[PDB]
Symmetry: D2
Subunit: 196 residues, 4 copies
């Protein structure tokens, strides 16, 4: 069965950028539920597959994508952040970013635009296009995961579901986007990029 | 030109069921934003329309539906609530609910389920089906409006976007659904209903 | 593994309403492919499920729904037609239809409207709503199956993908809809209704 | 008012690659229908717009995008074909394709894949990404237009709705994709391309 990963830092480690309450609820309630729901859903799919029940399989897709994606997305997200993060990546990811976006600030501007642009619940992503061999910005609705729905390998995700910022930033998603750069774990993003 | 309607009560009039900060922000920021963008999008659509720019018209659809829907949904939502609402509805509305759902309690359970089941942002709705002549429950994603996307006439809507309840109920949407029944303005729902029988 | 059902009549049995070529291609090529694709897809899903590969599972949903639905839909469709069909159902389905649509002709008008109204590829359906205990008309895009995506139990489906009528009716879907009533196997639809 | 453009060649000018009955029907019936409905939908949108009827505007979106897109896609499609087309493109267009896809053959394989992979009705497109300055392949469902829904400028589109090939190729879409390369008007694609460098 899938499991809720531990946080590589405590709930208030990202203060004052993302407050303690947001982190605690996001991980212990939101992500926790996705995992449990995912396990239930995956087990039902095993029964349906074994029975050759195509209708049941299709009927289960929404739950599998939503909770499955919820697990995939947040799992990556936690590793994308750090109390000791911020700044700019060091090395090959930085050169890749300059190459594909002109500069690191233009890139930030682009990911910010995509993230703030999401109508409703969603995610902003910096991903890697293997078919083309370059970085690419993308946005996904609800919990639809980047790789499973677009083929892009996720490097850095920005959760723009209201639960990710409302307590502290209310409706001002732009301020949440501005603040988050201060806690991005570029070493993790770099490692994800190098794994490509 | 569309405008932000005033709430028919103070921001804290629905406490303790829906707190004041939630109402204040939902109204003055959220709703206001939709109306602002709606007027912006409508004008751009008027320019594209007059120029025969079909590509522009199509590119503007998401913004028009999102903000236009946002204006429609919240305008209705404000009137659906009241510091003097709650309780069980009476009159023909109640009789209609018993016919199509069995009882008011069964209806509540049905709308609660449709509302809690929305993945992501959306709305739960009790609407009227003009084609078949009865009540019908439906759910809508993001700000997609009930009538414009399903043909059903909206009677009562429950906003399940997280901004409508997170500050107070966190991720426990079910508690929000349970609390909101205490502030439903059944008199308004009745008026929207009676307006269909016509 | 899933299998292509045999037709309960020959390819030209529905002439002059749906010509022989349409039927032969529809069954031996179109439906045949959906089954094969479905088996491939279902087997990949078994591997992904066993590996706990949520991304692979999600990435496979389109293929499973499309081909799985393709199999479900056409399987029902073949049983919904007959060289000896047409007319009106006899018994409880007829009373159900009068009750829910006023009359059999109003019902035909409704299913026709829904079917002809499909923008792009799709299906028109007469289904049964168990939650409400009544008949209900619905339309589904591409191969999305009725029950798996709406919960309604399929009774009669009208395939409005262009391959289902173009050879004979070209773009005139309304004429195809008019002609098909002559070969509807109402005994099968009735049996599907009674099974509810 | 939108109108049905004339084809720049006779209905059977693309034979034996795309037969005459397919072209005649595709143009005079299919396309004509989209333009007819587009003019109908546009006027209704103008009435709703002027009345501030947001619900109506939203309810009209599917029809506007479907028929408007249908007009846009086919108008471009007709110009993308020619009895004197086919072969490998030359000039800067060819040089651009080699840069972003490797070679013309690899590009063909890519567009063929995107086109054959469309589930249901749709279009395959070679478009220009103004943001990143290069060519890009994309697929669109039903009649959703490339530019209006993705922002990419259409250079070459391949209609994969069954009406575009069924009469001749039946369900073997791959044979249709292989045949259509013999009638591609690379001079037109070049003009649409050159129009972006600007
Ligand atoms: Mn989240
Ligand atoms: Mn709201
Ligand atoms: Mn078919
Ligand atoms: Mn076409």
């Amino acid at each position: 069965k899938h499991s809720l990963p531990d946080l590589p830092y405590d709930y208030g480690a990202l203060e004052p950028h993302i407050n303690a309450q947001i982190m605690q609820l996001h991980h212990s309630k939101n992500h926790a539920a996705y995992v449990n729901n995912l396990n239930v859903t995956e087990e039902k799919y095993q029964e349906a597959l074994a029975k050759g029940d195509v209708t049941a399989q299709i009927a289960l897709q929404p739950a599998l994508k939503f909770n499955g994606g919820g697990h995939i997305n947040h799992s990556i997200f936690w590793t994308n952040l750090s109390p000791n993060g911020g700044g700019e990546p060091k090395g090959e990811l930085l050169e890749a970013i300059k190459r594909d976006f002109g500069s690191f600030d233009k890139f930030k501007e682009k990911l910010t635009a995509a993230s703030v642009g999401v109508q409703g619940s969603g995610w902003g992503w910096l991903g890697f296009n293997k078919e083309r061999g370059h970085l690419q910005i993308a946005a996904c609705p609800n919990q639809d995961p980047l790789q499973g729905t677009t083929g892009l390998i996720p490097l850095l995700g920005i959760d723009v579901w209201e639960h990710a910022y409302f307590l502290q930033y209310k409706n001002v998603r732009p301020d949440y986007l501005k603040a988050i750069w201060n806690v991005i774990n570029w070493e993790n993003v770099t490692e994800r990029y190098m794994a490509c």
